[PDB]
Design a protein around this ligand. Structure first.
Ligand SMILES: O=C1Nc2cncc(n2)OCCCCCOc2ccc(Cl)cc2N1
Length: 269
């Protein structure tokens, strides 16, 4: 093999948070770029399982709209996860406050988001924290689902496992997660995708959380689509949202049917 092809340099920090930091790494020889997730296994009681699970789920992921997994390295209290580098950055940064983005762009991103989610659900995995800060873009603006630190298996040996753990981000989480003890995984991911669609078309989130105690949510259930946040959304995509953001998870539209929706199949718009 070629010498030095094992050394990667840290060019700059891409992201950071509770886990630690995400640095950009470039190969010394090939100059290939990849994202490195730096997680400090500090303390032993909420880590040996955390980082090890995310790694476990990643070794299963292989789809064009999902961040690719290259491998990991262990060193004392420092774990290294080599992930796909998406120079496009976060979807969140393509959303203009109070405005959103051109409908055609939002539709394409939505299609790709759906492709990824279909793949994941197809192999029994639920992301559980879909939001614009976790949806990355590559050089060609192709959407890719990232960060599987909250992900979990909801189907194994063809048997579905209801979830009970409450995770995600309040503005994006479905109502059943805040009202029921157990719930189906898939409708939860569909709901969050609906909130992401709203953000892309209005540049604002509809509510702090999906509870009847939150004024804006109540107004949604009452169909007050005038003026309020939904006023900036054309009737075609708004009709899709009316089917995604349904409180009863059992009545909520599923992905196969979202793919049959008028706006979803509308040329351009
Ligand atoms: O290039 C990547 N890859 C990647 C792959 N998997 C996870 C992850 N990052 O970080 C978690 C997402 C949030 C930080 C935001 O991360 C980024 C921010 C800005 C750019 Cl240009 C790239 C990334 N990320």
């Amino acid at each position: 093999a070629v010498p030095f092809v094992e050394d990667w340099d840290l060019v700059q920090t891409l992201g950071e948070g509770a886990y630690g930091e995400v640095q950009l790494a470039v190969n010394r020889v090939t100059e290939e770029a990849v994202a490195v997730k730096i997680v400090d296994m500090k303390r032993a009681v909420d880590c040996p399982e955390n980082i090890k699970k995310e790694i476990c789920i990643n070794k299963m992921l292989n789809h064009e709209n999902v961040v690719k997994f290259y491998g990991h390295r262990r060193e004392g209290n420092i774990q290294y996860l080599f992930l796909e580098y998406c120079s496009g950055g976060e979807l969140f940064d393509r959303i203009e406050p109070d405005i959103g983005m051109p409908e055609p762009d939002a539709q394409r991103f939505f299609h790709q988001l759906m492709a990824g989610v279909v793949y994941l659900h197809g192999i029994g995995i639920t992301h559980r924290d879909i939001k614009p800060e976790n949806l990355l873009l590559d050089e060609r603006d192709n959407l890719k689902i990232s960060d599987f630190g909250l992900a979990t298996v909801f189907r194994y040996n063809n048997r579905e496992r209801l979830l009970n753990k409450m995770c995600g981000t309040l503005p994006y989480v479905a109502p059943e997660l805040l009202k029921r003890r157990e719930f189906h995984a898939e409708p939860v991911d569909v709901w969050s995708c609906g909130i992401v669609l709203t953000a892309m078309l209005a540049g604002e989130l509809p509510w702090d959380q999906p509870s009847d105690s939150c004024q804006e949510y109540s107004d949604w259930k009452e169909k007050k689509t005038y003026l309020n946040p939904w006023k900036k959304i054309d009737s075609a995509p708004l009709a899709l949202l009316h089917k995604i953001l349904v409180e009863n998870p059992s009545a909520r539209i599923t992905i196969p049917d979202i793919k049959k929706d008028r706006w979803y199949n509308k040329p351009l718009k």
